[PDB]
Amino acid sequence: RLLGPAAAKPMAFSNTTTHSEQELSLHTGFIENCNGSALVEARSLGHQTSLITAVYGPRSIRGSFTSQGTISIQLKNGLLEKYNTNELKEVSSFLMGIFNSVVNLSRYPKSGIDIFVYLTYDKDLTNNPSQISSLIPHCITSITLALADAGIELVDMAGAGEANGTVVSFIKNGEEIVGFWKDDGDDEDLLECLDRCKEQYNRYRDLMISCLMNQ
């Protein structure tokens, strides 16, 4: 069976009953179904993130006559910290607008590339009470890893960083911006946001090449 009894209610936990550095771990090539795999994990402060990205492509589309390729990115919930399906597809369209400027589309006529990102675990350990902004940079680094493992041509590496809900994705060692995302945050601040994300971008730009050149 599935779903279960409709009269059952989910468990409720009460808040009144008993009471710098951003770690990173990268892997690639471990899913036999797809061409390129990736597994990024990050645990800073009271928020741990671990997601898996798989790339199935390039797939020759029957009867298609397109000049360049078509990228399909899809975010999918995992097992902890479930987000609404509308916001997941919003980040998907934002991500597709990024890799369409990075992936060599002209090198894949009459074919498409399907991306699958699984937010398998998004732990959060805040003491007492958009949260999706802290995962967009980690998702961009995961797709670029799986796209590189799948033998797909990527014009330069792509990374991003968070600066209080502000997510900026850079390219060419931060020379040009390929994506901009900002939820909540404050006003006037912009120069420090582009600076804190750029140094975080270079931290991810070289760490991705580390695991990609080993193994």
């Binding site: 360049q68 078509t70 990228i71 609404n84 399906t85 509308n86 916001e87 597809k89 919003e90 998907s92 369209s93 934002f94 597709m96 607008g97 369409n100 400027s101 589309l105 958009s130 809900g165 390219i171 060419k172 020379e175 040009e176 911006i177 390929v178 994506g179 901009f180 995302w181 900002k182 939820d183 909540d184 945050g185 006003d187 912009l190 582009l194």
Partner: protein
């Protein structure tokens, strides 16, 4: 209609030139003529209809519900329905997720202006119906929810905690600062405001910028306008576009709050 690759290269070279040769030839800060109707749905607390220049049309309805904010999180919900598209389409769920961020209770919209008792408040239901669309309609919808929220009337409250009661005839006007959303298209090194249908097809990238309380507010996006010519932009173009809306947004609010 679609565009041939012959005329696509004709517009790119004319728009990216240092004198931006727009198709209709307007200035990079001029908008197209707009018709806005308001107060035509009696069953709704507020309503508006907007007709763009390219035949694009959007209808907004505003309903209200008495809810306990101690148990109801978001006090403002946006429900978009584009004609000819499914409700689970990507082009619909993205705008639905984006419009609920520009109109988030406590962020772009202050939850204090629609509160009632210490226990209860009003929940605003903003329903969008896109009859016709040629480009990204997130900016056209934001104008429609602006004129509708600035013409919305909610029932007046009549006031030990008991359930609230309202007067029979007299109603209060909903005074809320409604955020505004603008679309910017970058073609090479030129920043364009309010891109047309054919203009947004040759653009290198796009910019979405919110505007509330007379200033730029969250959220802001950089979504593409066409998967063909997606080009990365220099950060000075992002600053130029983010500063160009500051120069012409009050001209919009003045021309939009007259009703």
């Amino acid at each position: 209609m679609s565009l041939s690759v012959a005329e696509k290269s004709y517009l790119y070279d004319s728009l990216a030139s240092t004198p931006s040769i727009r198709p209709d030839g307007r200035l990079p800060h001029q908008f197209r003529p707009i018709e806005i109707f308001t107060d035509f749905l009696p069953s709704s607390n507020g309503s508006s209809r907007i007709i763009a220049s390219d035949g694009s049309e959007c209808i907004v309805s505003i309903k209200s519900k008495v809810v306990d904010h101690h148990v109801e999180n978001e006090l403002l919900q946006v429900d978009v329905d584009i004609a000819g598209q499914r409700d689970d389409a990507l082009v619909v769920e993205t705008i639905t997720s984006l419009l609920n961020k520009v109109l988030k209770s406590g962020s772009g919209v202050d939850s204090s202006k629609l509160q009632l008792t210490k226990k209860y408040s009003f929940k605003i239901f903003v329903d969008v119906l896109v009859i016709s669309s040629h480009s990204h309609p997130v900016s056209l919808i934001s104008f429609a929810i602006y004129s509708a929220l600035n013409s919305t009337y909610l029932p007046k409250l009549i006031s030990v905690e008991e359930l609230p009661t309202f007067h029979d005839y007299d109603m209060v006007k909903l005074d809320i600062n409604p955020p505004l959303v603008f679309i910017l298209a970058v073609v090479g090194n030129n920043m364009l405001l309010d891109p047309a249908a054919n203009e947004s097809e040759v653009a290198n990238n796009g910019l979405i910028i919110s505007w509330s309380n007379g200033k730029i507010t969250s959220p802001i996006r950089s979504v593409a306008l066409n998967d063909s010519n997606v080009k990365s932009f220099k950060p000075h173009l992002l600053k130029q576009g983010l500063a160009m809306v500051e120069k012409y947004a009050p001209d919009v609010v003045r021309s939009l709050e007259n009703l």
